[PDB]
Amino acid sequence: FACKTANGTAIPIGGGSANVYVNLAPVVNVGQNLVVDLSTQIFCHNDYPETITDYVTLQRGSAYGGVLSNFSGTVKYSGSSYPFPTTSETPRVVYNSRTDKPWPVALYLTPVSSAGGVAIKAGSLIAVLILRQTNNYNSDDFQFVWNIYANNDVVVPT
């Protein structure tokens, strides 16, 4: 089981970490949503799908930088909504093909009432997402860590 990003960065069998740089709306008003759709960035596959089934969860998700200070939000995993920063591990998603398939995660972040000015500085870490892989054959519990960085500033007009 391994995972790759869009621009090529990869995390091998056994786990590891990588940096994903995401584009954000340059301007977002209080009450609007800022969307980070990782389903178009992170892709994972099962290296022996014929006999084995891979199980993937969001073990935790955490907010950093300006998203922590100036945003509320939720994460949507495989059809269901959960708070972000995360308060529990999510249900499992199955990976059963050697073909790279997306990780169905999306962050919805909305500036809070007191938000104003520059709320996210470009290049800064805005979240960390921990993907947990297990399977149906052994006790493997692997962590694929994704450090999410902003490609641009985000301004919340006041």
Ligand X SMILES: CC(=O)N[C@@H]1[C@@H](O)[C@H](O[C@@H]2O[C@H](CO)[C@@H](O[C@@H]3O[C@H](CO[C@H]4O[C@H](CO[C@H]5O[C@H](CO)[C@@H](O)[C@H](O)[C@@H]5O)[C@@H](O)[C@H](O[C@H]5O[C@H](CO)[C@@H](O)[C@H](O)[C@@H]5O)[C@@H]4O)[C@@H](O)[C@H](O[C@H]4O[C@H](CO)[C@@H](O)[C@H](O)[C@@H]4O[C@H]4O[C@H](CO)[C@@H](O)[C@H](O)[C@@H]4O)[C@@H]3O)[C@H](O)[C@H]2NC(C)=O)[C@@H](CO)O[C@H]1O
Q: Site size for ligand X, by CB under 6 A?
A: 11
Instruction: Give the one residue of 13, 94, 118, 122 binding a copy of itself; rule: CB under 8 A.
Output: 13
Which residues, numbered 37-96, are part of the site for a copy of itself (CB under 8 A)? 48, 51-52
Helices (H) and strands (E) in the chain, counts: 1, 15
**Strand (E) positions, 46-157?**
54-63, 71-77, 80-83, 93-95, 101-102, 105-111, 117-120, 125-135, 142-150, 154-156
Give the separation between CA 110 and CA 132, rounded to whole angstroms. 27
100 is in an annotated binding site: no
DSSP 65: H
1 interacts with, out of a copy of itself, Ni ion, ligand X, none, CB within 5 to 8 A per kind: ligand X
**Amino acid at residue number 51:** T
140 is in an annotated binding site: no
Which residues, numbered 6-35, are part of the site for ligand X (CB under 6 A)? 12-14
Note whether 8 binds a copy of itself by CB under 8 A. no
Note whether 47 binds Ni ion by CB under 5 A. yes
Task: Compute the least distance from the CB of residue 56 to a copy of itself, in Å.
Answer: 17
Nearest-CA neighbor of 15 among 1, 29, 25? 1
Cα angle 151-133-140, degrees, rounded to a multiple of 5: 140
Contacting positions for a copy of itself (CB under 8 A): 12-14, 48, 51-52, 136-140, 142
Contacting positions for ligand X (CB under 6 A): 1, 12-14, 46-48, 52, 54, 135, 140
Binding site residue list for Ca(2+): 45, 47
Contacting positions for Ni ion (CB under 5 A): 2, 47
